[PDB]
Design a protein around this ligand. Structure first.
Ligand SMILES: [Cl-]
Ligand code: NA
Length: 222
């Protein structure tokens, strides 16, 4: 069964750049658009706005941003992509005003094999020292990403999970590397939703940044 790695290389011309929607960002609400990879394998949804501090995204975004020092950076804590220079930034929430990151496989001969995943700098900084809204992690805290698969009609096909932090003691740290997230348990999913969660949460949702990163998204033939 042939494997293909989705790539957004050769799309960004400048350093420290990201996908920018065709529409006009506003400070009222997120607007939604989509982008597909150059091989027309997967459609990724993308939310965008500008609340007054510059372009703000949710859902998926391809970028080459390397800043792993600024407290609110969407860049992986590694400060670099797993493969090449381009990776995918994800800001995903579920619920009422939720902006979930849901990809759709377009070349339906393929299913997802998996992906590399890493913590965003924003989520990592929140866990190691807090960020006002988020509090520093201690024994018992965790950070998770759950992938839910669906068929074309939207019927659930399977679910997979991975931890990006799991503090057994006050002295532990979140995952600082790219790690492999096996997505074959989603079965023949066409649509895949990625939702982050944290032990640092309340009634309104999670306090740790709902930002994480993906790279080397791999498809395998069914
Ligand atoms: Cl648009
Ligand atoms: Na990459």
């Amino acid at each position: 069964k042939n494997e293909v790695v989705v790539s957004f290389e050769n799309l960004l011309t400048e350093e420290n750049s990201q996908f920018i929607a065709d529409g006009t960002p506003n400070n009222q609400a997120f607007q939604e658009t989509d982008f597909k990879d150059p091989k027309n394998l997967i459609n990724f949804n993308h939310y965008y706005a500008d609340w007054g501090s510059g372009y703000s995204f949710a859902g998926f975004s391809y970028m080459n941003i390397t800043d792993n020092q600024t407290a609110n950076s969407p860049a992986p804590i590694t400060g670099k992509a797993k493969i090449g220079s381009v990776y995918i930034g994800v800001d995903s929430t579920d619920g009422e005003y939720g902006t979930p990151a849901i990809l759709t496989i377009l070349d339906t001969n393929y299913k997802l094999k998996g992906t590399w995943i890493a913590n965003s700098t924003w989520a990592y900084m929140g866990m190691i020292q807090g960020d006002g809204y988020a509090r520093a992690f201690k024994a018992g805290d965790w950070y998770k990403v759950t992938a839910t698969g669906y068929d074309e009609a939207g019927n659930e096909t399977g679910k997979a999970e991975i931890l990006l932090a799991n503090y057994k003691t006050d002295n532990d740290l979140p995952v600082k590397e790219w790690i492999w997230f096996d997505l074959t348990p989603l079965q023949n999913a066409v649509k895949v939703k990625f939702i982050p969660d944290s032990s640092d949460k309340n009634e309104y949702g999670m306090n740790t940044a709902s930002y994480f990163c993906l790279d080397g998204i791999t498809l395998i033939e069914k």
